Scaffold this active site. Structure first.
Site, PDB file in Angstrom:
ATOM      1  CG  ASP A 142      -6.445   5.534  -1.879  1.00 25.27           C
ATOM      2  OD1 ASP A 142      -7.710   5.485  -0.353  1.00 25.27           O
ATOM      3  OD2 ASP A 142      -6.503   4.894  -2.099  1.00 25.27           O
ATOM      4  CG  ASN A 200     -11.023   5.899   0.073  1.00 25.56           C
ATOM      5  OD1 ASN A 200     -12.195   6.266  -0.205  1.00 25.56           O
ATOM      6  ND2 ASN A 200     -10.646   6.270  -1.194  1.00 25.56           N
ATOM      7  CG  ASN A 235      -7.859   6.804  -5.210  1.00 22.00           C
ATOM      8  OD1 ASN A 235      -7.629   5.929  -5.652  1.00 22.00           O
ATOM      9  ND2 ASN A 235      -8.441   7.667  -4.324  1.00 22.00           N
ATOM     10  CD  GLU A 295      -3.243  -0.676   0.357  1.00 19.93           C
ATOM     11  OE1 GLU A 295      -2.906   0.320  -0.056  1.00 19.93           O
ATOM     12  OE2 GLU A 295      -4.156  -1.626  -0.246  1.00 19.93           O
ATOM     13  CG  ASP A 297     -12.978   7.493  -5.513  1.00 16.81           C
ATOM     14  OD1 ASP A 297     -12.605   8.513  -5.648  1.00 16.81           O
ATOM     15  OD2 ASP A 297     -13.852   6.560  -4.619  1.00 16.81           O
ATOM     16  CB  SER A 301     -12.320   9.187  -2.371  1.00 13.99           C
ATOM     17  OG  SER A 301     -11.071   8.141  -3.089  1.00 13.99           O
TER      18      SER A 301
END
Length: 130
Positions: A53, A60, A46, A35, A49, A51
């Protein structure tokens, strides 16, 4: 901060991650590795959408932490996303625990399915003394 492998393993053990909701320490290590590469300040936007991380576990902003700029967001963990960019990973761990308390468990992270599930993950904790 970028953790060294064994240093992180011991820290996660101390924080009660070993076997949390049936998830072995080796699995949490495999997840952090893919990750963020064990980096606490890692952030990923991202575009699809809107959002982001955040942190070592790439948590998220739509469901687990609040950053104010994510559409249709929720805050299950109730943390500011800023807390997941600290060198001290206590808050990131508390958030990761919350994520897996849901039915999907560790499967919430697609990266875990692609590179950790059904594999030999011993390598992630070998020699660390945990």
């Amino acid at each position: 901060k970028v953790f060294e492998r064994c240093e992180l393993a011991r820290t996660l053990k101390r924080l009660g991650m070993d076997g949390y909701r049936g998830i072995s320490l080796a699995n949490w290590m495999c997840l952090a590795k893919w990750e963020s590469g064990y980096n606490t300040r890692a952030t990923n936007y991202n575009a699809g959408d809107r959002s982001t991380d955040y942190g070592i576990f790439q948590i998220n902003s739509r469901y687990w932490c609040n950053d104010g700029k994510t559409p249709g967001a929720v805050n299950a963990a109730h943390l500011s996303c800023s807390a997941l960019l600290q060198d001290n990973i206590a808050d990131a761990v508390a958030a990761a625990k919350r994520v897996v308390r849901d039915p999907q468990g560790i499967r919430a992270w697609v990266a875990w399915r692609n590179r950790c599930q059904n594999r030999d993950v011993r390598q992630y904790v070998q020699g660390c003394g945990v």
